[model samples]
Target: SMNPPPPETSNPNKPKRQTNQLQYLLRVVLKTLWKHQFAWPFQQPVDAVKLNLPDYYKIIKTPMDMGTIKKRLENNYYWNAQECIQDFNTMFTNCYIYNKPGDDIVLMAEALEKLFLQKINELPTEE
Candidate 1:
């Protein structure tokens, strides 16, 4: 599809409350990360059985993913952008821990990692 993908949306019939600048920018970067070509594997949590991730839970105590990140953000799980970013780092680190350096998953994770860092680094500060 040539069209640029849209950002995440809520119920069409629902009227959303106005959010602060911090939330808005955080959401924007989140959507940008989701739109990436290599974001499929990271869109949700790892399926240990379906994906045959042996001892997945044992290796990664706290699994972080985009879906969870969004959920937590909406739930007010993060006090600031840095808090959510901490989870992002954990997600990327988990990828490195579970996969080989040359693995396709690792490659995709690397791509996402770079994009995330770039986005967050330039993420505008909110007053």
Candidate 2:
């Protein structure tokens, strides 16, 4: 017979906190792209993996709310995240309207890289 695992104890005091803005945004974008089964060319990036991207999923019949997006961006991990989100929204809108991919990939990559590396740049350097 196979042995069973023991139940894990839960901590009430250490209740899980909600994801920070960067995690929330990346989770949505990564999961949305995955759910649609789009041909996203790049490998899963480190930041996405670190944010637990796969854990995010769309609930049935829920709609995207611009209000909520704005609020989330307000609490963003870095100043760049807000700028990136705005740029993405504008680019995405224009691309769909004109039926062109334009520089969407490049822009997204640049923004993501900046956001991911933001904290690293702020680390105190050895003299």
Candidate 3:
């Protein structure tokens, strides 16, 4: 006879762990963008006064969700960096995508770096 089924088994939260690390890095990039108020491709330039720490801190860690991004893009308007970050995170969370050796995540990150790095160069030195 087959062995009796086990009552339960614990599955490691590997997916969550993986996404956290990816998002942490993405957050760093998002913060950098805010610190500089770097002009995103489609968005108008941000107001310097709005970069105040209290309000800025609130948004620094937020990843803009994908639904908003799609809506903005469809309307032909530029979305903010927070939305961009959220959209990236959602690609993994909502889509269950893993960044394997040959996956598109690698290619996507490379493309993103070009934009992120270029934007930083345009900002003035922090006082």
Candidate 4:
């Protein structure tokens, strides 16, 4: 998954909250997923999953809107759980644009080695 970048430098007069920004970002990212019917199940009957990558990217760039995502989740989840899940799967698969090439993959593996080994060390050892 593509990690979102940190919040930009803000104004001195008008303050910015990091917590709020992250919360806002999470909502936006998930909501954009929802908007494209990337939801897990298909709550409502749709023609098909016809996603336009360029168009979707444009939509996601807009500021995070919590109210919209929350409302949609409530409505769709309530209406039809299965449909929502289907839509979610549809969206999840579409999220990744490309796989890393050979060199990139090697670099990624090296970067993750440290993190994964650290996590493994955290687990309890067998007696």
lDDT (Cα, tens digit) per residue for candidate 3, span 63-114:
2333344444344333244434445454333212323444554454445546
Error of 2 at 126 (Å): 32
> TM-scores, in order shown?
0.77, 0.27, 0.25, 0.24
The residue pairs in collision within model 3 are: 63-86, 64-82, 64-83, 64-86
> In candidate 1, what are the lDDT values of residues 1-127, reduced to their tens digit?
1222222334445433323534753577678888889999988777776777678877777678888777766755545666667788989999999779889999898888877767677766576
lDDT of 2 by residue, 65-115 (tens): 233343334444233345335533543343234333446655544454444
Rank the models by lDDT, top first.
Answer: 1, 3, 2, 4
* Position 36, candidate 3: lDDT: 42
Q: After the best TM-score superposition of candidate 1, give how far the Cα of residue 4 lies from its true spot, in angstroms.
A: 36
Candidate 4 residue lDDT tens string, 41-80: 3222211224323344333332222233344443332223
Q: Which is the winner by TM-score between candidate 1 and candidate 3? A: 1
Model 4, position 106, has a per-residue lDDT of 39
Q: How far is candidate 2 from the true structure (C-alpha RMSD, Å)?
A: 15.7
Which residue runs of candidate 3 sit more than 4 Å off their true CA positions? 1-97, 125-127
Which numbered prediction scores highest in lDDT against the true structure? 1
Q: Please give the range of 10 consecutive residues that has the lowest summed lDDT in model 2.
A: 56-65
Ranking by TM-score: 1, 2, 3, 4
What is the TM-score (0 to 1) of candidate 2? Answer: 0.27
lDDT of 4 at 15: 31
- When 3 and 4 are scored with lDDT, the better candidate is 3
